[PDB]
Amino acid sequence: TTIVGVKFNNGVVIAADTRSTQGPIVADKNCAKLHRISPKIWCAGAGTAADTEAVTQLIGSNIELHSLYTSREPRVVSALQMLKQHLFKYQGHIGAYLIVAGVDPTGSHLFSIHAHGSTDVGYYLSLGSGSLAAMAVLESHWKQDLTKEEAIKLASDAIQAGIWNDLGSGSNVDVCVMEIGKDAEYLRNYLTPNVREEKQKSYKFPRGTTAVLKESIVNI
Template sequence: MPGLSFDNFQRNSFLAAKGYPVPKATSTGTTIVGCRFDGGVVIAADTRATEGDIVADKNCEKLHRISPSIWCAGAGTAADCEFVTQLMSSTLELHALSTGRAPRVVTCLTLLKQHLFKYQGHIGAYLIVAGVDATGPRLFSIHAHGSTDVGYYLSLGSGSMAAMAVLETNWKETLTKDEAMTLCASAIEAGIWNDLGSGSNVDMCVMEVDKPAVLYRNYRTPNVRATKEKSYLFAKGTTSVLSTKIRPIVKTVPYDIFEEAVVKDDDKMEVDS
């Protein structure tokens, strides 16, 4: 059936009347993307961190290292993304030491979704996991409730719609590394310009088969602060002084000053005052 469907409006109104409030929309305030190419995978993110309507950090890091060949981009609650990825990094390192083999991307995906599913979305981590292993380049996304997706290009965060428009328009089956990097950077910039929760710079990480991962910090800086047209420092005397009044300090409570010194001799100790 063409057009939008509002069938759930009556259902939500009925549940609200019974005491079940309608859940509010949550903005993660981020744009993260991932894209596969011939022989590798690219992930990218913006660098704006927000606290409600306030920009808390203009150049934060949203790309997290899990293993030498596995990285992830995080959207949602900053602390949750940071500590969840640190936990997975430690877990995968122990797994690699136990098995004697390099960890696979799908292993990281399984551990992450099992961990997030236990908390039923209360850990606000929305992740794009990417890397290369024995099976080749892999790209996955994980939502806070534990659901996962797999694809050749992915996007999450409040700016994901703007980024996805760029990805769907310019993606093709045979991408080179440079084309994938340009595509991901352009998708992040679309989120920066069209989403208030995204902004500042573009960070990027490139993972290729049989090569170490390369992190490009501030790969693009589209929001460089411009020089002010004029100085806003006013010369002394610009604002006139209308009146001056000097109030002397008056002692309202009488007080005396005492000084004590302890003098120590060989045979006695006395206090002089």
């Protein structure tokens, strides 16, 4: 996994790759790793994948309930508080590491959460097995008050560095742009550098190749 967040002059952009691996096998080539906690709060996680999915789903449900209750747009810090308290309650046994980025009436926020409940503020963050490769690019090229275009380019290129230089990271780049004044822009497969090599031959078999003992029709 390669995840990065990047705050820029008017918002924050979070990006991730799409390869999903069980052991050394690529279970899914186009796994979507960016999750909505709210329309303008987005997160991407590492560690135990199932725990990240469950905790983000729980926090999103609770946050939408609270937004309806208070009749206010969710704060990113509210999600941070609830998420880290839940993570702490289990003393790290849920093993969810997250980068949560979003926009709320108080500004644009970028945080990270670790399985044990610790959190950090940041201007640029990285996570996952490709965290170091992406962080190298983020250190080399990040600057104060990036424009939206520069921010997208920088985050995309850090994710590309993780893709090229890490085994557990590959395929396509997902990008989500949260900006202060307007809606979040989710860019599914923003970059698609890993196109599929063509088959040398079509390996379709002639019909009847397989041997069949019985055939039946099932009353569903």
